[PDB]
């Protein structure tokens, strides 16, 4: 029903409109790929438009949307940043043919009424915090999925845990799209790109390269076994300042029932003044490669 | 490769995968899939939806058949007629039948679920408190792995049918779903495998669940009250039937509206079998 001009980035904002047009677009052979962001597009979002513009005759749909769901109590969504015009900038500079920006009304007409419980792994890491949070990922991942049903949708790796459960979400419902996770893009010094890295002063900015220094220092450490992996890591956080640890663990990839067997992910959470910053990494337990 | 489809002839698929990749390639071919999910031990009552699917031009029909343990309160008693039921379905000029293991649709447990709204905590989740997430999960499960054009329940479960409505328009799903009415035996009992378990005081007082809706749904020319009232003095005339409940709603089963359109709903108990029957009603 609606227009959509190819090579140009072509904004929506109806769910029917999107979901008419990438159904249009599917059946004439081009496969959607889908990036589900917030807005507030950094080289981190880039990095998986770029991820999604590769894929042979695919057109990209990004969609911008400021989920209230995933959001606790308190101002953190009045705090979560907004940059609508820089972001769709980018995106016309990417060469995105499609940003979805739907209003909360549109999404949620009826309120929380259906929605999705996630497994288990929602209630830790991130989940201690905040209880609710990935049941508000998870509820507005799926509505995105059914609205653009996209062959392929794109994650982070630097939100790990979203990503796992994006996975759980899908095999456990069945739905037919295949989940990419990208690399965490990270700035010159290590530090993983984040929105939340604006908050940072001069010095926090500093002592935040702790992280991703001892996520490395653990990766490496890791051919002497699980132990000196962690304490290699704890050591170079300690030695941050002003770093305060909120986690620091060893799990097995899927971070699910199973304990660490060789292959694993170090994950780490710290909160550097008001700022809570986190991070991970790929770990092989006694591999020197 | 695609499975194999022979048209015209009752294929059975029990791995997901395998239903899911032919009932995508027949949507290629220009058919439109039909979906009516079922635990099997099928009767006329579930032949009606088998019926309403095969009318629509196009159709490829798909009769899934599932026990599902979700659904189950806090399992192995319920009825089994594997080779029986796919005599009917071939009878009916079905073509697919899914027939998944509980293995198969759960492979990890129950781990990432459907949260109903609040709905699904009243009437039959008075007693069955978890029973609707099972429902809702079991559905979105089969509505992605066979992606129909249409799916079909019937209206004799009224609630579950309203759930599966906000299903859909919450997630946003891509399919239309449809109520079909409720098929009764001669004296108007809702037909219901479980109708079996009643003897015969039990079967003869049982009538007055449908004998008391249709009298409110025709007393309802004299108001909401009088519809109500009407309804109970007919359960009341009858022995052995204990009421759970007896509510008229609007047709979304939210509060009743000073007049117009509403739902009439009943639940009731006979012996160790619970009965429930509902109907269409107009105020005024
Ligand atoms: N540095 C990075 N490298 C790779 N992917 C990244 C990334 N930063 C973010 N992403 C991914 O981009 C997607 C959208 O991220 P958002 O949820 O919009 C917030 P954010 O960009 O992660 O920052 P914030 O939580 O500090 O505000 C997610 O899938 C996320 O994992
Ligand atoms: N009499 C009837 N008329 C129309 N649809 C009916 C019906 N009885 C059952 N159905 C529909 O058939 C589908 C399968 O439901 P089932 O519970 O498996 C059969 P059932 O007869 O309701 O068994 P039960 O007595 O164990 O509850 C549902 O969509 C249900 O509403
Ligand atoms: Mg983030
Ligand atoms: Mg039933």
Same mark, same amino acid.
């Given at each position: 029903?609606?227009?959509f ?13 999107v ?10 052979? =081009? ?15 880039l ?34 940043? =907004?940059?609508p ?26 309120g ?39 062959? =392929? ?16 979400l ?13 690399p ?11 929105? =939340? ?41 300690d ?7 909120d ?8 971070l ?34």
């Amino acid at each position: 029903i609606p227009a959509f001009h190819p090579g140009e980035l072509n904004v929506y904002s109806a769910p029917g409109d999107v979901a008419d047009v990438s159904r249009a677009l599917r059946l004439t052979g =081009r496969r959607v790929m889908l990036v589900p962001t917030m807005g507030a597009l950094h080289e981190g979002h880039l990095a998986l438009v770029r991820a999604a513009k590769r894929v042979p005759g695919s057109v990209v749909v990004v969609s911008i949307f400021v989920n209230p769901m995933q959001f606790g109590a308190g101002g953190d969504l009045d705090a979560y940043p =907004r940059t609508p015009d820089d972001d769709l900038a980018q995106l016309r500079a990417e060469g995105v043919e499609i940003a979805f920006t739907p209003t909360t009304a549109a999404m949620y007409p009826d309120g929380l009424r259906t929605t999705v419980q996630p497994g288990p792994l929602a209630a830790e890491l991130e989940g201690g915090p905040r209880p609710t949070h990935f049941a508000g990922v998870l509820t507005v991942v799926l509505k995105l999925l059914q609205i653009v049903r996209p062959d =392929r949708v794109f994650f982070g790796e630097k939100d790990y845990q979203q990503l796992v459960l994006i996975r759980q979400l899908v095999a456990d419902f069945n739905l037919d799209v295949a989940v990419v996770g990208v690399p965490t893009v990270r700035e010159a010094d290590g530090l993983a790109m984040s929105s =939340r890295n604006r908050y940072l002063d001069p010095a926090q900015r500093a002592a935040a390269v702790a992280l991703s220094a001892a996520l490395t220092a653990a990766a490496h450490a890791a051919t002497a076994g699980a132990q000196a992996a962690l304490d290699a890591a704890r050591a170079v956080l300690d030695a941050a300042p002003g770093v305060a640890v909120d986690y620091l663990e060893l799990r097995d990839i899927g971070l699910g029932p199973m304990p660490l067997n060789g292959s694993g992910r170090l994950l780490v959470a710290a909160r550097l003044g008001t700022t809570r910053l986190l991070d991970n990494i790929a770990i092989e337990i006694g591999t020197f490669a």
